[PDB]
């Protein structure tokens, strides 16, 4: 009821104002497990490839924030090999004014700008801390076999 025309209003938000390089709506017609695909940003080791995320809303939602798992592998700090995402408004800071297109820009950015202090994976984090070069040119590899 609440947890329903929430979502159903975020989704008729998008289904008039789209957005430019995110994508993103229900799978099938289960209004609470939505699929999404975003572009790596053009500055970053993901540039041009595609991601695609899973999206699970809780049912007392948007007073509990959404599951958010990435489908695709990605070679990140802050994201593991299940495709889980270390993200602070996922969790701590989430909160009933956020929408799901807030997320999707604040994870946008989070390939651009990780956070090694969140090590959900401790040898890209060490490796992305002291030879960037090395972490930069095996993220662009795993674009090319996977973020396809």
Not at 16 to 44: E, F, K, N
Not at 56 to 85: E, L, Q, W
Not at 95 to 103: E, G, I, M, Q, Y
């Given at each position: 009821?609440?947890?329903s025309?929430?979502?159903?209003?975020?989704?008729?938000?998008l289904?008039?104002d789209?957005?430019?390089?995110?994508?993103?709506?229900?799978?099938?017609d289960?209004?609470?497990?939505?699929?999404?695909?975003?572009?790596?940003?053009?500055?970053?080791?993901?540039?041009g490839?595609v991601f695609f995320?899973?999206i699970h809303?809780?049912?007392?939602?948007?007073?509990?924030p959404?599951?958010?798992?990435f489908?695709?592998?990605?070679?990140?700090?802050?994201?593991?090999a299940n495709?889980?995402?270390c993200?602070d408004?996922l969790?701590?800071?989430w909160?009933?004014?956020?929408?799901?297109?807030k997320?999707?820009?604040?994870?946008?950015?989070?390939?651009?700008?990780?956070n090694?202090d969140?090590?959900?994976?401790?040898?890209?984090?060490?490796?992305?801390?002291?030879?960037?070069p090395?972490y930069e040119?095996t993220?662009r590899?795993?674009?090319?076999?996977y973020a396809?």
């Amino acid at each position: 009821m609440s947890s329903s025309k929430r979502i159903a209003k975020e989704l008729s938000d998008l289904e008039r104002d789209p957005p430019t390089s995110c994508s993103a709506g229900p799978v099938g017609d289960d209004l609470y497990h939505w699929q999404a695909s975003i572009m790596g940003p053009a500055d970053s080791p993901y540039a041009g490839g595609v991601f695609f995320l899973s999206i699970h809303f809780p049912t007392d939602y948007p007073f509990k924030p959404p599951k958010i798992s990435f489908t695709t592998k990605i070679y990140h700090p802050n994201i593991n090999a299940n495709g889980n995402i270390c993200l602070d408004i996922l969790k701590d800071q989430w909160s009933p004014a956020l929408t799901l297109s807030k997320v999707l820009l604040s994870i946008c950015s989070l390939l651009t700008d990780a956070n090694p202090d969140d090590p959900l994976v401790p040898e890209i984090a060490h490796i992305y801390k002291t030879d960037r070069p090395k972490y930069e040119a095996t993220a662009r590899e795993w674009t090319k076999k996977y973020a396809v």
